Amino acid sequence: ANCERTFIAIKPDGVQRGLVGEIIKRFEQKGFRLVGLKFMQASEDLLKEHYVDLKDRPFFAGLVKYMHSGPVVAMVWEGLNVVKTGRVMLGESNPADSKPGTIRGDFCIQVGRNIIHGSDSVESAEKEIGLWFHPEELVDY
Amino acid sequence: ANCERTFIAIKPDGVQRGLVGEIIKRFEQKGFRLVGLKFMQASEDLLKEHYVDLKDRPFFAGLVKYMHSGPVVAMVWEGLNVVKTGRVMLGESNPADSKPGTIRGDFCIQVGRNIIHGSDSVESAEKEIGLWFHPEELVDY
Amino acid sequence: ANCERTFIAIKPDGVQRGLVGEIIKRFEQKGFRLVGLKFMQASEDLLKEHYVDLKDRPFFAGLVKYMHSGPVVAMVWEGLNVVKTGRVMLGESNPADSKPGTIRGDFCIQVGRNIIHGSDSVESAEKEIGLWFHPEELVDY
Amino acid sequence: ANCERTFIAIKPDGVQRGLVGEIIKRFEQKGFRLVGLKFMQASEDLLKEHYVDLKDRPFFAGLVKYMHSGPVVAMVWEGLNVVKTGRVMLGESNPADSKPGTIRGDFCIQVGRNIIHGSDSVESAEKEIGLWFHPEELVDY
Amino acid sequence: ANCERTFIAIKPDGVQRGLVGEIIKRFEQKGFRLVGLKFMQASEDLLKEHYVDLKDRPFFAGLVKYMHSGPVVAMVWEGLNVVKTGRVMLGESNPADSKPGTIRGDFCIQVGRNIIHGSDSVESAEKEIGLWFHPEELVDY
Amino acid sequence: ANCERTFIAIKPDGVQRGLVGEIIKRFEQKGFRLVGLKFMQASEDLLKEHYVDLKDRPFFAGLVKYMHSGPVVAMVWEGLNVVKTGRVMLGESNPADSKPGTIRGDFCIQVGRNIIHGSDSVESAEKEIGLWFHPEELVDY
């Protein structure tokens, strides 16, 4: 009905410069409800399960260690139609093909080292919520 | 010549959270001239005259009371080519079909409860100025 | 009980550069309630009544015309303990004796041309509300 | 040596309006290092242990439920001389005795419902880190 | 390899209102490296060489003196793929055909008096770097 | 009369993180006039002349190389009563003895590595203008 949850995590590239701000600011500007915010140094198994469909890539081996090197912050948000709303908030993957006024279109430099990853589909979010955010760790209201 | 006036009013949905700020900020940053700013609890006749062409709508009855429930703020602005400039500043009606970096594309959630209404055309503005903003209540310079 | 109203008006010196923004932003960020916002080109009688106790001043004649030259914006706000809260928000009259992070301590240059005037006391506000803001023009909630 | 940790938690009063932003922004502006960020609905035992020295207060019973009503967010930060630096960042308890440009001096309204609580002393932080933030849940670097 | 330099200068129209900020902010928000920042009152020979290919224009005579009247600020930036990045950062020349969230799409009013000019191509920058920014006046790192 | 010039330079510590923004923003918020902005890698002679009265200090040798290691940006500003106005804008040297809402009171961590240096007195500015900012490189208006 109105329990659309979206998993979004900030890659360590931004947290090196911090810049965690203005993200929740944009989220509340749109008017979304925070449901959870937990950050942990995810182990290699979690990273490979996150990109199990992307393992057969030469860049997969590089990224699975590059993002592992620094600490990472994960977050889940609740809102109506938040699916694809987060996507349009971020912007398309390629920095060149990313208009300003967005997240990916105003901060990222290269596809190799981006800052934000998210759920492409509701079905993807249905597993991006689990195995990293343990249950009964959120708020329902 | 250069007397293009545009009537723009903030619906009570935003004033519930306030958030009246940054609007005049964007207007002055673009470089528009304020001509008037008056707010009143508009009566039902004013609301129905505002949407006389939209009366034959099932959603009209709901909105004409929903926006009447809270207090509203109205505003008029003077600037060159401000017509359709305000429109591109806000964004298209549907929140999904509204890119970020705008007004309607960064704050609104659903078409039912939006925050900003404006003049689609110059002819529309020619009556949106009147019957709510009483004359000799503005500044010409 | 909780009906503390404060009259605050922005002098034309700032409206020349606009800069009306961030004021309502600070007010809502503190958590005050807007009760009214009307602006008019005040006549000489209104200005002299505003400073009837300051008429016997050589600078009074200069200011009563300098601020009259441009348009002015007046505003009233409702909040608990807003009295002297607005004062500490603005800062002491002399720009030199005004710490940063405030209104008067971050924008004003000289005592001759300031941007904001306010109510020193509750009794002062009891008349600063009237004779400029006509009654039944506010919102009680 | 350089492992000064400070426990700071945002009370639900602000999270009702969100406003979690700009806090990490100020922290990175000063140049502090984030060490942990976890939020949970703290049980009554945690709240009473937090204010064990304040239990013999009539206001204690009210606050221990008022802050429990909504969800709360806790946070720990690492930085040199962060002790009393967080304190001067927030401001003195009474909103009246709190200059602007701070946290407590720019957001809070009344002593009854504040938004931020922190560690008065290093010894206080030595227990404010524990019993809420479980160990091996932070980052050392 | 990674020595892509772009010459960008702010026309005096903005410097009349200042507004030099939020420009470098976006550059560091994207994460570009500053290589040089010098401002001088450019002489007519410098101005005509800047628009040598635009001399045969009726508007050329007007613009060459309009921006000459006030002081101008020039700047050069270093970054990967910086070319066409500033171009999309500003926006297309016509203010009407310029979406918000950008520089040209959020500040300029008319094509006659814009605020920012830049290098369309790398080859254009290869002469825009010289004859205004004297060599050995930058930083390589 | 009204030609009060103040020399202010940003140390490389901040330029490592950039953060050059918001400084000109505060300056225009107060309403000061920019007169010059030039940045160069100052040689050792310039640095020792800058602190000729501070040479007989053990920390002098460390700082004269620490600030020389990175590039530095210098700036001069024109405004009425700008003397000691810049000082109150920055804040007292010790970060602990520096209230928030300022420059030194919101960014600096330790006295060893600060970000901003300025002119204590008008007489000091009378030489801080020269020997670094070459004459006929400013704007008088």
Numbering used by the authors:
A (entry chain E), B (entry chain F), C (entry chain C), D (entry chain B), E (entry chain A), F (entry chain D): 2 to 142
Copy out sentences from the published article reporting this entry, exactly as the authors wrote them.
Nucleoside diphosphate kinase A (NME1) is a multifunctional enzyme that was found to be pyrophosphorylated on Thr94 in human cells. A major role of NME1 is the synthesis of nucleoside triphosphates, other than ATP. NME1 catalyses this process by transferring the γ-phosphoryl group from ATP to a nucleoside diphosphate (NDP) via an active-site phosphohistidine intermediate. Oligophosphorylation was critically dependent on the catalytic histidine residue His118, and cryogenic electron microscopy analysis of the modified proteins suggests an intramolecular phosphoryl transfer mechanism.
Next, we investigated the structural aspects of NME1 in oligophosphorylated states and treated purified ppS94-NME1 with ATP to generate a heterogeneous mixture of oligophosphorylated NME1 for subsequent vitrification and cryo-EM data collection. The hexameric structure remained unaltered, even in these putatively oligophosphorylated states. Although heterogeneity posed a challenge in visualizing individual oligophosphorylation states, a larger density around ppS94 was identified. We were able to verify that this density corresponds to the pppS94 species localized at Ser94, with a likely further decrease in distance between His118 and the terminal phosphate. To visualize individual higher oligophosphorylation states in the heterogeneous dataset, symmetry expansion and focused three-dimensional (3D) classification of the phosphorylation site of one subunit were applied. This analysis revealed three subsets with different extents of cryo-EM density appearing around ppSer94, which is indicative of the presence of different chain-length oligophosphates. Class 1 contained 37% of sorted particles and exhibited only little additional density, which probably corresponds to pppSer94 in a different orientation, whereas class 2 (32% of particles) and class 3 (31% of particles) had larger densities, possibly indicative of higher phosphorylation states. Furthermore, class 3 showed a connection between the additional density found for the oligophosphate chain and the density for the loop consisting of residues Lys65–Phe61, which includes the positively charged Arg58 that could interact with the negatively charged oligophosphates. Oligophosphorylated NME1 displayed a notable amount of cryo-EM density at the surface of the NME1 hexamer, and it seems plausible that oligophosphorylation could act as a recruiting element to engage a different set of NME1 interaction partners. Next, the impact of oligophosphorylation on protein–protein interactions was explored using oligo-pS94-NME1, which was generated by treating ppS94-NME1 with ATP.
